[PDB]
Design a protein around this ligand. Structure first.
Ligand SMILES: [Zn+2]
Lengths: 62, 204, 101, 151, 129
RNA sequence: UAAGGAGCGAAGGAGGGCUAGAUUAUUGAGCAGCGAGAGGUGAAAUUUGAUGACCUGCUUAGGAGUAACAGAGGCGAAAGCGCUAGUCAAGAACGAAUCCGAUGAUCAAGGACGUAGGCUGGAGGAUCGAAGACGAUUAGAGACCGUAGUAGUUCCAGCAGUAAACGAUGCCUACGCUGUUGUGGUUAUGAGCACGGCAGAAGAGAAAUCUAGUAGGGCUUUGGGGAGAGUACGCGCGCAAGCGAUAAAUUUAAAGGAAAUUGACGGAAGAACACCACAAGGAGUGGAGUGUGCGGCUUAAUUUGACUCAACGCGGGACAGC
């Protein structure tokens, strides 16, 4: 079923993964206090909006 | 042939703690009370202090052990069988640059049960002092250990099990040791580490 | 020619010392010569703590840690890259390494 | 992993079944569980080596996890007919053609095998083709050779 | 609503294999048991995080059938005079049990350490490779 | 006497012998639960399991060991010594207005100790494991790896006498720069005495470095270019294994002799870089027929160079004659 959370990217940190495909990012959710750390794989600009399937799964390494 | 269908649950009950009932155990169904006694009596379980009390979340470092003793209807009644500190506590306590002090002693209850007790303490580094290590001299360690044995003898020898269990709950022996031995040297982490039942008297 | 002033070991004012066994190959190595490594590892991985927060029955929970001291012989320490070959002036520098997790 | 290649069916008028030790196979990586994107030809005459100099009939790198996968054919043939054809070993109601030994992979499917029949009259039928699991031939002396329910 | 019906779960995690085994609180009755080697084919995969995860699901299913809801976890490596680090796979059994519905009680490391020990295998030189 | 021995006072240490106890762990048996695999590796096979393994309980029986704390920490003549109490002798250092008075240094011969492995007799036998036997790998493995397995590994009474028994630096006794950090006593609290670690300096040395500075202080061991040779004959010890001590003939211009310098090499380690590298993306080649070059075979002749990148529509190599 189509659960979704929309989150705003505030910072990018590190090019990451084999071949440097991913970017570590900090994201704040739009309607909750939660702020997460996540890896994202496309090109990303600060102030982008991204759609998450989970509000909890995290990349603690930051 | 689903053998699981053919099993009887019984509830475990305990004494001298705030919580009376702690769980339930299976057995295959049997015709004769003598068989059920021989199957259930002699079993053992363990429970954390934090589960059988209402208490500060800090007190999770200690476990109590109970042996099944008697059957009445739905209920099995179980008796005190020892005490133990959790592995995280023991391993996390030891640090480089300090001395460990350790002891073993045997005591007798008024009920006739004989118990063996293990005890630990650690030296402490004083404030306004600049040397890297705070080891204790070997002769001084013997002074502390000598004192520990008279404290354990005074507190636990010739008492009832109902009295011993509450002393272990409230951690009175640790507290007494830190008070009494401060004159010799400063100490920290004083605890009863393990309690073990050695002989139970032949009784009916 | 003599490569190190301390013969590669920490023994002084003694005849003989206890041996210990290598974690990787079980070879015997003297305690005063063995390469030592300290570990403090959580029982639960970082990628599960966000599930633990909804799984636990308690109001709050502290994850248990596990503690280890590991010993290695020279060959294993070099091969596993705990230590590396160094220049004639670098050999003399002594500094404490981090505790692993 | 070891896999025996059986030829199963109802055999009539057949002295021996001979099998080309050339198998089009589907392989799955035992590391990442991904199926290889194409079938691979496993042949007894293909000579390859492991990274430890062991002879194998197939060496394939997994495209996803880069792990090496190896397969060796052990012919179970009791004899070579005309020095060319591997006579499958008769076992009760079936024929054991070969044993495939996979390392780093699973064999998920054997697609086809080229089969030759030696009749009880000493006639060879090369490269027999099954229609819906059936094969049948008659000789000039009205002797029938057949395979039914081929698997 | 319902009370927490608890079982024990034991986990062994070596370099070679992982074993998962549920019991009553007494440890004297067995409810369900599995291993990494039960589900996988290749011998090199019996320690695999994946094989551990498959094997955990079967155990979780049988417990849900027998009507259990909550679990205490006691986990170990091999110990004795051998290796005493928890192997791969051990920490994925626990996370899997949490994706299934089960409530987690308490976790404890129960590896058998020796105060001193018998002589280890391998001779004075050790394995040469 | 900042020479020695005897003695007094308070204290310190894994120094040694004996007596009585201890928390776990590894194996083995008994019984109970469960019903299919366990073990081992880089990857696998020997191997073991429905006579119920593995894993989880409760009982027991043995014989070793003292984890973490634990260190450029302590003790001992060296070899060596790490759980807790009690007991028995002697020693080192320190404090100080105790006693005797040259009793001392070093040492052929002679005597006592000496890790481990080995040997003679008794006790015992958990774990590990020479020999021996298998499974794999290889051209071959008798080896390395895995399964298993004996003498030994432990104790008491003895024999033996060797180690890279090394800080590769003899023992007493001197004269000698600074800073820092330990251990045990004592203190006018300023410091000392004994036993150490570390970092410079100055001198020294072929250098590397410094137990190596200064010097006709005393006494013992010991070397004299490589080899043959720590071998032969004789002798002394030992149950044996062997050990101690020690030659000639013959050969040869240097010696894998010492340390330091530059290259070449390695199956090392560490940083960098690049679609003629890769990762994420496009078009193909490898399969068919044909065109063309290379090897092989044939022929009277099928003329010939070139072989990893950096040989093979390459030798301006599309040959009817040229
Ligand atoms: Zn090693």
């Amino acid at each position: 079923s189509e659960e979704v959370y929309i989150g705003e990217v505030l910072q990018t940190l590190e090019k990451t993964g084999p071949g440097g495909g991913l970017t570590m990012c900090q994201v704040q959710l739009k309607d909750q206090k939660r702020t997460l750390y996540r890896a994202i794989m496309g090109p990303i600009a600060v102030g982008d909006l991204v759609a998450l399937l989970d509000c909890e799964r995290e990349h603690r390494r930051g | 042939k689903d053998s699981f269908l053919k099993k009887e649950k019984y509830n475990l009950r305990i004494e001298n703690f705030p919580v009376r009932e702690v769980g339930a155990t299976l057995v295959n169904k049997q015709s004769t009370v003598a068989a059920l006694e021989k199957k259930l009596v002699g079993r053992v379980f363990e429970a954390n202090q934090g589960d059988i009390t209402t208490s500060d979340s800090a007190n999770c470092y200690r476990k109590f052990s109970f042996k099944i003793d008697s059957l009445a209807g739905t209920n099995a009644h179980a008796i005190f069988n020892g005490m133990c500190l959790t592995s995280e506590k023991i391993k996390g306590m030891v640090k480089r640059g300090l001395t460990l002090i350790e002891g073993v002693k045997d005591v007798v209850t008024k009920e006739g049960i004989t118990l063996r007790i293990l005890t630990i303490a650690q030296s402490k580094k004083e404030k306004n002092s600049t040397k890297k290590t705070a080891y204790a001299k070997t002769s001084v360690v013997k002074e502390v250990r000598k004192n520990i044995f008279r404290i354990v003898d005074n507190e636990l020898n010739g008492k009832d099990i109902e009295q011993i269990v509450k002393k272990l709950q409230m951690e009175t022996v640790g507290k007494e040791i830190e008070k009494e031995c401060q004159k010799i040297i400063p100490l920290q982490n004083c605890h009863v580490l393990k309690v073990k039942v050695v002989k139970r008297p032949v009784k009916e | 020619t003599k490569k190190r002033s301390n013969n590669g070991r920490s023994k002084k004012n003694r005849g003989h010392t206890r041996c210990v066994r290598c974690e990787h190959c079980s070879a015997m190595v003297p305690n005063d010569k063995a390469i030592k490594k300290f570990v403090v590892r959580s029982v639960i991985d970082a990628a599960s703590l966000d599930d633990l927060k909804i799984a636990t029955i308690y109001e709050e929970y502290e994850v248990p840690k596990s503690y280890y001291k590991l010993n290695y012989c020279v060959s294993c320490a070099v091969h596993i890259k705990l230590v590396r070959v160094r220049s004639r002036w670098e050999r003399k520098i002594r500094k404490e390494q981090r505790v692993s997790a | 992993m070891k896999y025996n290649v059986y030829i199963e069916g109802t055999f009539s008028g057949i002295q021996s079944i001979m099998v080309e030790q050339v198998y089009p196979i589907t392989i799955k990586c035992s590391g990442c569980n991904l199926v290889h994107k194409k079938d691979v030809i496993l042949s007894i005459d293909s000579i390859n080596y492991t990274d430890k100099d062991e002879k194998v009939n197939l060496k394939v790198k997994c495209a996803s996890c880069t792990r090496q996968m190896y397969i060796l054919i052990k012919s179970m043939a009791t004899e070579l007919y005309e020095e060319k054809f591997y006579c499958a070993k008769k076992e009760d109601n079936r024929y054991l053609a070969s044993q495939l030994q996979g390392r780093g992979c699973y064999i998920e499917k054997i697609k086809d095998a080229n089969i030759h029949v030696l009749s009880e009259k000493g006639r060879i039928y090369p490269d027999i083709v099954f229609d819906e699991g059936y094969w049948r031939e008659e000789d000039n002396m009205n002797n029938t050779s057949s395979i039914e329910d081929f698997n | 609503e319902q009370r927490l019906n608890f079982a024990l779960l034991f986990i062994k995690a070596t370099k070679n294999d992982t074993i998962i085994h549920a019991t009553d609180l007494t440890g004297a009755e067995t409810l369900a048991k599995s291993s990494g080697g039960s589900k996988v084919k290749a011998h090199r995969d019996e320690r695999d995080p994946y094989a551990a995860m498959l094997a955990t699901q079967d155990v979780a299913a049988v417990l849900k059938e027998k009507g259990y809801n909550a679990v205490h976890i006691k986990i170990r490596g091999k110990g004795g005079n051998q290796s005493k680090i928890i192997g791969p796979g051990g920490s994925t059994v626990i996370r899997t049990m949490m994706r299934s519905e089960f409530k987690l009680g308490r976790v404890e490391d129960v590896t058998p350490v020796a105060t001193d020990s018998t002589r280890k295998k391998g001779g004075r030189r050790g394995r040469r490779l």
